[PDB]
Amino acid sequence: SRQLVLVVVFVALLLDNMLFTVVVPIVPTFLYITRVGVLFASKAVMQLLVNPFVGPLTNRIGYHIPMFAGFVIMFLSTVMFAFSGTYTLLFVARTLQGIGSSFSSVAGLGMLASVYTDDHERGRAMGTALGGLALGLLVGAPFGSVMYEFVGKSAPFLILAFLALLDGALQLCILQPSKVSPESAKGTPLFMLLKDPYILVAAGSICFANMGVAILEPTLPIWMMQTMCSPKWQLGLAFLPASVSYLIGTNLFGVLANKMGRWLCSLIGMLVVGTSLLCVPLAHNIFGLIGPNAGLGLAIGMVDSSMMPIMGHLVDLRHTSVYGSVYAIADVAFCMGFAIGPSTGGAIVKAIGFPWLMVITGVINIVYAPLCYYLRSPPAK
Amino acid sequence: SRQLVLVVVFVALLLDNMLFTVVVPIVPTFLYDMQGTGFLEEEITRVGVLFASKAVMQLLVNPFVGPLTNRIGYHIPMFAGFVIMFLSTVMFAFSGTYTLLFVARTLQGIGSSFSSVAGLGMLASVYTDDHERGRAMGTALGGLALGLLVGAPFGSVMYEFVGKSAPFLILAFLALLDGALQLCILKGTPLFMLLKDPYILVAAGSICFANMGVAILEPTLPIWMMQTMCSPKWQLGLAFLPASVSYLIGTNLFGVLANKMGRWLCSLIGMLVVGTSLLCVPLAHNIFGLIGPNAGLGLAIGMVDSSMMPIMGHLVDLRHTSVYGSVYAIADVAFCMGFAIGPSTGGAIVKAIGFPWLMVITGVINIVYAPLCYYLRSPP
Numbered sequence: 001s002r003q004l005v006l007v008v009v010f011v012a013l014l015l016d017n018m019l020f021t022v023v024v025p026i027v028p029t030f031l032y033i034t035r036v037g038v039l040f041a042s043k044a045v046m047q048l049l050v051n052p053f054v055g056p057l058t059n060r061i062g063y064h065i066p067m068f069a070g071f072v073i074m075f076l077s078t079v080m081f082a083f084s085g086t087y088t089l090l091f092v093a094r095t096l097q098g099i100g101s102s103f104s105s106v107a108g109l110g111m112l113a114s115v116y117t118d119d120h121e122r123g124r125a126m127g128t129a130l131g132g133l134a135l136g137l138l139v140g141a142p143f144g145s146v147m148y149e150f151v152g153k154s155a156p157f158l159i160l161a162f163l164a165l166l167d168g169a170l171q172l173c174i175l176q177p178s179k180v181s182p183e184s185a186k187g188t189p190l191f192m193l194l195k196d197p198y199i200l201v202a203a204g205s206i207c208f209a210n211m212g213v214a215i216l217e218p219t220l221p222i223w224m225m226q227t228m229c230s231p232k233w234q235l236g237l238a239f240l241p242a243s244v245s246y247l248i249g250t251n252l253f254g255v256l257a258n259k260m261g262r263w264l265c266s267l268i269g270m271l272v273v274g275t276s277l278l279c280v281p282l283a284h285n286i287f288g289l290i291g292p293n294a295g296l297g298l299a300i301g302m303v304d305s306s307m308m309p310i311m312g313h314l315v316d317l318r319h320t321s322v323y324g325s326v327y328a329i330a331d332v333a334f335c336m337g338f339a340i341g342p343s344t345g346g347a348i349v350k351a352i353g354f355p356w357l358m359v360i361t362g363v364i365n366i367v368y369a370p371l372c373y374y375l376r377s378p379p380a381k
Numbered sequence: 382s383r384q385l386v387l388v389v390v391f392v393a394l395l396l397d398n399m400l401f402t403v404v405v406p407i408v409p410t411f412l413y414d415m416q417g418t419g420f421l422e423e424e425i426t427r428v429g430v431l432f433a434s435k436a437v438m439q440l441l442v443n444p445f446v447g448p449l450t451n452r453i454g455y456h457i458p459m460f461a462g463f464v465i466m467f468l469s470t471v472m473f474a475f476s477g478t479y480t481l482l483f484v485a486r487t488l489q490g491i492g493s494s495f496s497s498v499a500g501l502g503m504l505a506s507v508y509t510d511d512h513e514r515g516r517a518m519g520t521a522l523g524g525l526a527l528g529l530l531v532g533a534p535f536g537s538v539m540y541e542f543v544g545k546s547a548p549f550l551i552l553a554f555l556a557l558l559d560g561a562l563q564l565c566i567l568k569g570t571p572l573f574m575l576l577k578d579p580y581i582l583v584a585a586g587s588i589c590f591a592n593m594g595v596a597i598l599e600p601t602l603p604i605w606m607m608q609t610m611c612s613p614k615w616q617l618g619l620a621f622l623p624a625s626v627s628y629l630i631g632t633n634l635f636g637v638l639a640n641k642m643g644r645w646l647c648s649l650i651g652m653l654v655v656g657t658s659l660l661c662v663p664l665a666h667n668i669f670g671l672i673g674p675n676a677g678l679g680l681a682i683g684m685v686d687s688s689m690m691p692i693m694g695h696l697v698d699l700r701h702t703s704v705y706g707s708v709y710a711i712a713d714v715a716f717c718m719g720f721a722i723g724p725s726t727g728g729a730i731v732k733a734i735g736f737p738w739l740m741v742i743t744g745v746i747n748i749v750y751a752p753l754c755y756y757l758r759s760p761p
């Protein structure tokens with residue numbers, strides 16, 4: 001094992017989100033705005049479409065085979081990135097990274113849900129898994145930055161590949177993905193899960209918080225150059241507090257959510273993220289963003305740790321104990337924000353403006369915040 | 382004398398707040414006295430309409446009090462306040478019928494309006510140094526908070542130990558002491574013009590919606606309390622004690638601290654905390670579960686009251702010509718609106734749907750209105 005498959009998911013999410021973030025400081029320097037924006041969103045769009053095809057499959061194949069597929073797909077994704085020097089290869093490698101990320105994330109979260117049956121222990125495990133994901137997001141970009149600065153471009157991809165082989169050796173050691181074991185219980189269909197307001201409310205809260213982070217992610221530096229006229233070295237330093245607060249919140253609230261009540265934690269988290277998004281566009285220097293960005297990260301960790309086990313609790317309370325479809329919906333809500341963010345952020349900012357855009361983000365978060373009371377006590381079947 | 386006028390206005394404001402706070406755990410207890418049976422569902426709407434009468438009459442009487450104060454000075458209008466306060470105090474003690482309580486509430490409202498206007502006018506006229514007026518108004522307004530702290534447990538502690546009429550007799554006797562002291566005694570931008578711009582209307586709406594939580598929690602919390610957890614009759618006054626104590630700590634601390642972090646952020650946080658506290662209030666299964674949500678509601682209401690009053694002052698000073706009671710006059714419209722609309726709609730809501738749905742609606746209203754305080758910052 002119960003605790004044995006926790007490091008396999010921790011390591012698997014650590015490297016996958018490492019490849020997601022390490023690509024940032026190395027790609028646009030090689031090619032030298034809207035043309036590169038579609039490249040960053042290739043992972044989100046393709047992985048969004050492949051998400052509905054991974055959920056229903058898990059009822060018969062199992063979780064081990066998707067995890068091994070995520071390992072191998074990350075292997076090709078890092079090896080192609082290490083050697084690619086053209087857009088036509090970079091887009092294909094990024095799409096492979098996206099599909100591998102979707103496979104590995106869905107399989108890992110499903111395996112974590114299936115391994116732990118107690119509610120509090122499952123919440124703690126999901127908190128530590130999201131902590132590993134936040135740690136990977138924190139360590140990705142500076143790692144590639146220093147590698148491309150002193151050592152070279154292909155070196156970080158090779159190092160991530162070596163770590164990937166080590167992770168795959170771990171998977172072969174513990175999981176043993178050699179046989180197809182179908183789950184005895186037949187999972188509920190994915191379309192029927194969209195007719196349950198509990199799952200829709202939880203997925204909407206997760207998607208709205210992740211959209212609130214993924215909109216501020218790509219368009220913040222453009223506003224920084226347009227208004228503050230700041231040096232380039234602290235562009236990642238501005239978003240560093242968001243990652244650090246994300247890691248701290250997801251590591252600390254995994255035990256606190258059970259005691260404080262999940263619905264109250266989700267409500268307070270979305271209120272905090274709405275207030276932080278409101279307060280972000282009023283800063284006039286880099287020092288004013290450490291507060292609101294840290295609050296945004298803490299609120300996102302609040303919502304994630306509160307509503308990741310709430311999907312499993314709802315599925316156990318109402319439907320059968322097959323966790324693939326609900327967490328597939330959760331991953332879709334996770335990744336549609338990253339699909340919407342970098343492609344359309346510049347267009348929306350040029351159309352309406354950045355402070356207005358954060359106004360709608362905070363307003364929608366605050367207005368949908370009272371809807372989290374519905375999850376206080378979903379009646380059983 | 383300077384001390385005499387200050388003590389007169391302080392005891393008058395305290396008496397008004399005490400009479401407001403002392404009827405909360407007495408009216409439902411009497412109406413039950415005529416656990417047990419849940420027959421109060423048929424009378425909840427009448428209980429709310431009795432509470433709304435004072436606010437309705439006060440809202441009707443605020444525009445009128447100005448001309449009489451201008452024509453015939455200030456001391457004569459204040460004398461009517463004490464006598465009507467005496468009549469309301471005696472009538473509340475000797476009341477036995479539902480009809481008489483409405484008359485007592487209406488007289489209490491008219492006396493409160495007359496006493497407030499006359500006392501603040503006399504305090505403004507007596508002190509003319511332009512600097513001690515702030516301290517005098519501060520102590521006069523803090524008398525209301527002290528009376529609010531002392532009044533709520535008083536009514537629910539003297540009813541079951543001494544008698545129903547005893548707190549009303551003591552309040553009337555306290556009012557009578559000022560009569561001997563009161564016996565030995567001796568312009569622009571009207572309110573309807575000030576409410577036109579949206580910066581002041583949003584402020585008044587924010588204050589009214591923040592106080593509407595306690596306004597709706599007054600008439601229906603005791604009935605729900607006896608219906609659902611069967612506590613003895615002397616916990617009802619103590620249950621609202623956290624709602625006052627947390628209000629005092631909130632108003633002091635955030636009057637100290639709000640200007641550093643921003644007035645609009647404090648208002649938004651207070652509105653959100655009001656919404657979450659009202660949402661978490663009806664989930665308690667015992668009296669000990671209410672010290673948390675009530676304390677949070679009091680703290681958030683203190684946040685809103687301490688943060689939005691300076692915003693109203695700056696807004697009224699920036700564009701229009703203000704007087705000493707300009708912020709008081711606009712603020713009094715918000716509290717009167719809230720107290721008039723709260724219980725009357727709340728009783729109908731608890732009759733039509735369940736009691737927790739009323740708190741759900743008020744919390745949702747507070748949460749959706751909390752974004753609208755963003756407009757107040759950097760006014761033109």
Ligand SMILES: COC(=O)[C@H]1[C@H]2C[C@@H]3c4[nH]c5cc(OC)ccc5c4CCN3C[C@H]2C[C@@H](OC(=O)c2cc(OC)c(OC)c(OC)c2)[C@@H]1OC
Nearest residue numbers: 398401402405522525533595621624628690708709712713
């Ligand atoms: C009845 O007592 C009041 O009516 C006062 C309070 C209203 C409300 C309240 N009622 C309760 C009754 C309870 O019994 C069960 C228990 C708890 C509460 C609470 C807790 C929360 N609480 C807050 C109190 C607010 C007070 O009003 C001001 O503080 C004020 C200050 C000013 O100076 C800045 C003004 O001028 C600008 C001004 O303009 C008119 C008003 C208000 O009137 C004086």
